[model samples]
Target: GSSGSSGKPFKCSLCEYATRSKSNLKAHMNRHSTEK
Candidate 1:
């Protein structure tokens, strides 16, 4: 079930954000960290 990689290839629902790992999501979250 794993892609044999540390990151998962996925697209964001709100924007054209594509990431290769969960860390990328964390980084993306930072962009909205100050928002509600």
Candidate 2:
């Protein structure tokens, strides 16, 4: 009995951004678009 698949738990590699969904992660990635 495991509850490991209960959430998406997405994470960002370039920053400390994280969420429980892919769409949120995608939105967060926008902030890094202007970084160099």
Candidate 3:
């Protein structure tokens, strides 16, 4: 589900979410607070 080498460091504590950039991780964190 991942590729290349972006050096991802941000990890979600609520799920398996991960991203190569901090901004991406910040945006992804919003999902954890929103309802489906």
Candidate 4:
């Protein structure tokens, strides 16, 4: 079932970075922008 619908409210793709915070997620995404 892959990550399997654990209902954590912010399970995403291609990484283990999961959260329930938009702010925190945006922080990670900004890093992705730099990585790319």
Candidate 5:
């Protein structure tokens, strides 16, 4: 039997950001919001 590994790590090319999961990456980007 074979098991699958996690998805490819996401890295923000426009900035120095990286995350292990898409959900986490989205959360990180939200913090950058300038809207009040």
Candidate 6:
């Protein structure tokens, strides 16, 4: 339903966490982890 969504990677499922780097999302979503 959207474009460039996957290309814009490292998106957090628990929250609206998004960034170009995992470290950015990881640090942003500190306790919010996803298993998918």
Best by TM-score: 3
Whole-model lDDT values for every prediction: 0.69, 0.78, 0.79, 0.70, 0.74, 0.70
Per-residue CA lDDT of candidate 5, range 1-36, in tens?
356845358987656788878998898887677752
Q: What are the models' TM-scores? A: 0.44, 0.61, 0.62, 0.50, 0.50, 0.51
Per-residue lDDT of 6 in model 5: 50
**lDDT tens digits, residue span 1-36, model 6:** 586646557777766767899877768786654553
Backbone clash count for every predicted candidate, in the order shown: 0, 0, 0, 0, 0, 0
Off by over 4 Å in 5: 1-8
lDDT, residue 20, candidate 2: 81
Screening candidate 5 with a backbone cut-off below 3 angstroms (N, C-alpha, C), the clashing residue pairs are none
Residue pairs clashing in model 2 are none
Lowest-scoring 10 consecutive residues by lDDT in candidate 5?
1-10
Clashing pairs in 4: none
Which of the two, 4 or 6, has more TM-score?
6
Candidate 6 local Cα displacement, residue 7, angstroms = 5.2
Question: How would you encode candidate 1's per-residue C-alpha lDDT over 1-36 as one tens digit per residue?
Answer: 567746447766666777878777778866864663
Give the least accurate 10-residue stretch of model 3, judged by summed lDDT.
Answer: 1-10
lDDT of 4 by residue, 1-36 (tens): 766756656655756787898678777766676657
Superior candidate under TM-score, 3 versus 6: 3
36, model 2: CA deviation in Å?
Answer: 4.4
- Runs off by more than 4 Å, candidate 3: 1-7
Candidate 6 similarity to native, TM-score:
0.51
Better of 2 and 5 by TM-score: 2
Off by over 4 Å in 4: 1-5
Model 1 worst lDDT window (10 residues): 5-14
Off by over 4 Å in 6: 1-7, 31-36
Write candidate 3's Cα lDDT for 1-32 as tens digits: 37675644887878888887898989988887
